[PDB]
């Protein structure tokens, strides 16, 4: 218990927003290396959504960031998640060769860092860690 220096308490968890810009995977790895093993933040209520938005808004160094990673991650292995065409046939052939994975979740400046959006996992952005201290 007790949030360490640099971490902010909300309910039973500790949180910190980092302006280090990292891919989704690197950000999750970095959080797991903090304290007793944090993760990218999960958001489980309206009050926690408010809190995380406020926390990002408190970070002066995050002034010009457009996206901030949180811990939403698609588990489907497909690169696009519609497995049937509108005509009812199954998807086999795909031509995704020019595109990049969009299977990571973020908060976005455009909408006040509240609504979740999906974005490109390999892009480097600020992020927020959430810890249950113990």
């Amino acid at each position: 218990e007790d949030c360490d220096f640099g971490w902010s308490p909300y309910d039973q968890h500790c949180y910190q927003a980092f302006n280090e810009q990292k891919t989704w995977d690197e950000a999750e790895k970095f959080c797991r290396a903090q304290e007793n093993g944090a993760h990218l933040a999960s958001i489980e209520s309206n009050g926690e959504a408010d809190f995380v938005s406020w926390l990002i808004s408190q970070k002066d160094e995050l002034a010009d960031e457009d996206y901030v990673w949180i811990g939403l991650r698609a588990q489907n292995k497909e690169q696009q998640c519609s497995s049937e065409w509108s005509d009812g046939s199954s998807v086999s052939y795909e031509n995704l060769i020019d595109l990049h994975t969009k299977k990571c979740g973020a908060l976005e400046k455009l909408t006040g860092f509240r609504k979740w959006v999906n974005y490109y996992c390999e892009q480097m952005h600020a992020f927020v860690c959430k810890l249950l201290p113990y």
């Binding site: 993760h39 696009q80 998640c81 052939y93 031509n95 609504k115």
Partner: protein
């Protein structure tokens, strides 16, 4: 065989349309055809090549809808910390897939974007 203004490839008929429409309106336009049709689906590279040969002359570099919609729903989103995903607050937007009338490679687009399209039915 295929009606006038449509083109034949391996038992199906195809027709490009230039009128820009959003995904839902485009798919509905194909569905209102005398033979009920759908936005184009691709089952092979050779099929995609044929279709771009169709689109190249009049659709040119325009975006062209294909029959895949809301591609980010159904991804089995979960939290990295294993928390339950009960509370939800996603932005209300969806993406659909398109190609360029010049090239077979797929592109993600907001479903409310207006694009050209190609309809397809089985002969």
């Amino acid at each position: 065989d295929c009606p006038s203004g449509w083109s034949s490839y391996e038992g199906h008929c195809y027709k490009p349309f230039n009128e820009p429409k959003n995904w839902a309106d485009a798919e509905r336009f194909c569905k209102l055809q005398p033979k009920h049709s759908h936005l184009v689906s691709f089952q092979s590279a050779e099929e995609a090549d044929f279709v771009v040969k169709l689109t190249r002359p009049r659709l040119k570099a325009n975006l062209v809808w294909m029959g895949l919609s809301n591609i980010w729903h159904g991804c089995n989103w979960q939290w990295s910390d294993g928390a339950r995903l009960n509370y939800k607050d996603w932005q209300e937007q969806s993406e659909c897939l398109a190609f360029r009338g010049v090239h077979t490679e797929w592109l993600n687009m907001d479903c409310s974007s207006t694009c050209s399209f190609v309809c397809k039915f089985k002969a």
